[PDB]
Amino acid sequence: EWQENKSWNAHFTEHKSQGVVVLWNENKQQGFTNNLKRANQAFLPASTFKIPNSLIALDLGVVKDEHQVFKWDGQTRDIATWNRDHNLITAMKYSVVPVYQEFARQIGEARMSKMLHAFDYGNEDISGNVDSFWLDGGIRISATEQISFLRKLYHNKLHVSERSQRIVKQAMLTEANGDYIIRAKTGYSTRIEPKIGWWVGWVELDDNVWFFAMNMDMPTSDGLGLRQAITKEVLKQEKIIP
Ligand SMILES: Cn1cccc1-c1cccc(C(=O)O)c1
Ligand SMILES: [Cl-]
């Protein structure tokens, strides 16, 4: 069941923004969104694609473990944090595209396509460059499809090893305190209109899990912090976090 709560739109209007937040109450098997239509609109995943990409690279042995160092190729890029060595944890933390492009090249088109089909991921279309299709290719996924994929990951039900799923969930760790744990991944799609920002993941509580997927229009990088801030405003309104 899906329920529409337009009162969350105030959190977007407050910041002259437009977007969608989708929540799923795992215990109750109930979903909530401010915009049912946009919740099912499929967009490029951009760096949220680092979740499946990590899973595939680990299961195929392209990445050995979360400590393997992927050395910087020496090309100075516009993101300072990318011009350094990384492991899986830091590469997800800083959304280090060039590390994941190398992964994708080693995975290859055929294994990439097969895995995404096995994951039931979005429209399963990797058309484009094997090392950029999640940024400017044919793959599309909606906020509700992100949640359905993440639920499989949470439960170790994806068709990769349990170990691979455990490592990626570790790498998704974003915030933890005495009240909740957030495992999540941001995205920023700039190469093809509409430019949007993503945040997808879940909130672990003592006795429930709330999955979330949000996206919002992002004409400039100035608003990127609104991805987390708006989501948290919704979570606070629903009393999921303090
Ligand atoms: C600052 N920036 C401009 C374009 C892309 C980025 C960027 C780099 C690293 C992480 C993130 C993020 O969304 O978390 C964004
Ligand atoms: Cl952890």
Mutate to test the pocket of ligand 1, among 86, 188, 191 (most ligand atoms within 8 A of CB): 188
Q: Is 148 annotated as a binding residue?
A: no
Residue 188 CA: nearest ligand 1 atom is 13
In terms of DSSP bridges, do strands 196-204 and 209-217 run parallel, antiparallel, or are they unpaired? Answer: antiparallel
Residue 16 is labelled as binding a ligand: no
Domains, the chain, in order of start with CATH, read: 1-242 (3.40.710.10)
Does the CB atom of residue 192 touch ligand 1 within 6 A?
A: no
List of residues 6+ apart from 206 with CB closer than 8 A:
none
Q: What's the DSSP call for residue 202?
A: E
Which of helix, strand or coil describes residue 233?
Answer: helix
153 membership: H or E segment, kind and range: helix 143-154
Q: Are strands 2-4 and 30-33 parallel, antiparallel or unpaired?
A: parallel
What is the Cα–Cα distance from 24 to 170, expressed in whole angstroms? 21
In whole angstroms, what is the distance from residue 185 CA to residue 192 CA?
20
Q: How far is the CA of 188 from the centre of ligand 1 (A)?
A: 7
Nearest CA to ligand 1 atom 3: 221
Which amino acids are annotated catalytic? 47
Burial 7-44 (b: 16+ CB within 10 A, else e): ebbebbeeeebbbbbbbbebeeeebbbbbbebbeeebb
CB of 186 within 6 A of ligand 1: the answer is yes
What is the distance between the alpha carbons of residues 56 and 173, in angstroms, rounded to a whole number? Answer: 18
